[PDB]
Design an enzyme around this catalytic site. Sequence first.
Site, PDB file in Angstrom:
ATOM      1  N   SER A   1       0.794  -1.218   0.000  1.00  0.00           N
ATOM      2  CA  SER A   1       0.000   0.000   0.000  1.00  0.00           C
ATOM      3  C   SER A   1       0.833   1.277   0.000  1.00  0.00           C
ATOM      4  CB  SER A   1      -0.984   0.012   1.175  1.00  0.00           C
ATOM      5  OG  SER A   1      -2.311  -0.191   0.729  1.00  0.00           O
TER       6      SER A   1
ATOM      7  N   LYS B   1       0.588   3.725  -2.681  1.00  0.00           N
ATOM      8  CA  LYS B   1      -0.410   4.789  -2.657  1.00  0.00           C
ATOM      9  C   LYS B   1       0.189   6.145  -2.420  1.00  0.00           C
ATOM     10  CE  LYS B   1      -4.096   2.071  -1.589  1.00  0.00           C
ATOM     11  NZ  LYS B   1      -3.984   0.580  -1.511  1.00  0.00           N
TER      12      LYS B   1
ATOM     13  N   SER C   1      -6.856   4.240   2.373  1.00  0.00           N
ATOM     14  CA  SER C   1      -6.200   3.380   1.346  1.00  0.00           C
ATOM     15  C   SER C   1      -7.221   2.512   0.599  1.00  0.00           C
ATOM     16  CB  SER C   1      -5.112   2.488   1.977  1.00  0.00           C
ATOM     17  OG  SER C   1      -4.002   3.262   2.446  1.00  0.00           O
TER      18      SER C   1
ATOM     19  N   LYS D   1       2.000   6.623   5.590  1.00  0.00           N
ATOM     20  CA  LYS D   1       1.342   5.501   4.944  1.00  0.00           C
ATOM     21  C   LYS D   1       1.749   4.154   5.543  1.00  0.00           C
ATOM     22  CE  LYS D   1      -1.151   6.053   2.292  1.00  0.00           C
ATOM     23  NZ  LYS D   1      -2.619   6.060   1.924  1.00  0.00           N
TER      24      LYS D   1
END
Length: 348
Positions: free
Chosen positions: A36, A39, A102, A205
């Site tokens: 992720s 992202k 996310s 993140k």
Amino acid sequence: TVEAPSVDARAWILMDYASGKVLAEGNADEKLDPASLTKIMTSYVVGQALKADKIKLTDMVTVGKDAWATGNPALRGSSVMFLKPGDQVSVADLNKGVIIQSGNDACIALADYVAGSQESFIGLMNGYAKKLGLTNTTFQTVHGLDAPGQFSTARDMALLGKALIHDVPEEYAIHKEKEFTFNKIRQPNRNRLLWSSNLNVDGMKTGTTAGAGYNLVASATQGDMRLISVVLGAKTDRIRFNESEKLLTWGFRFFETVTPIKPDATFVTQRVWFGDKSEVNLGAGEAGSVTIPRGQLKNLKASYTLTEPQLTAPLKKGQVVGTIDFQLNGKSIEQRPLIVMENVEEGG
Ligand SMILES: OC[C@H]1O[C@@](CO)(O[C@H]2O[C@H](CO)[C@@H](O)[C@H](O)[C@H]2O)[C@@H](O)[C@@H]1O
Ligand SMILES: OC[C@H]1O[C@@](CO)(O[C@H]2O[C@H](CO)[C@@H](O)[C@H](O)[C@H]2O)[C@@H](O)[C@@H]1O
């Protein structure tokens, strides 16, 4: 020296935001599953689209069979806003879905809207990646779900985090948002470090790979100072956060960041030959910051060396013509490019 902390993870790095100084690292160039953290780049690109006013926060985007937790198989099992095809959603809302939640569907919907297609968007992601010097990063999806040739490194993620904060600060600012509400349900940021009492954390993140373990890119501030940490392949969610916490805490406790050569400041004025100006300002540009052990400003001394004995026109703003040496206790701790601060054209 200051002894670097031990880190219970696969790879990690700790970077100063202003100076770029790497304070601590292990396996920082090992290629690993970003998951992720992909992202971050997704959001970098959306942030650039907004900053360029190619899209607006108020724009309404139509969701495609593309962005459907269902009629896109790879979306199953994955975190998701639950969009359906025909839905009309805010760029703002999708942007928050990418950032705070996310949402992998949010990723697809926005990429289609920014770039026309996922493949074109991924082209943008890897474009910036090369631009930014992410030499060991290639993206293969808009959302960071499993794909064959997709990797990054702790070093590249920090560099990318640093560019997000620097280049699209309005897009970075959303990353500290603890929640947002979509379809009457509040959706929490899964960055638990935002709730830390012992740090001012404001990004960035989380990610959790196939088998490799748990990831975090975090950034925090303390006085004038900002640090970025990356931890890849921690074995538990808990270790993911406390290792990040302890890296950041170590960096702020024992180091400071100072700026002896400010951007747009003149470090040497040098004669130039054969130009329409006889003299030219040289400086560090933005590179003028250094991270040193606490207490050591007293002892910081800067030196320059020109690479040519005598400077000749034409010269362009940004050109390198020598070397700034930063010395500490009379021992040499950093070197930076000595740059021309003004164009000077050859005479006529
Ligand atoms: O995402 C926009 C969406 O969020 C709301 C609150 O649910 O607005 C919030 O976020 C906006 C920025 O996108 C701010 O302008 C606003 O102050 C804040 O309440 C909705 O109003 C909006 O539809
Ligand atoms: O920074 C840890 C420090 O903050 C506390 C709350 O004051 O924990 C917060 O931050 C943790 C991660 O840093 C979260 O896991 C926790 O849920 C959150 O409350 C203290 O527990 C801790 O000493």
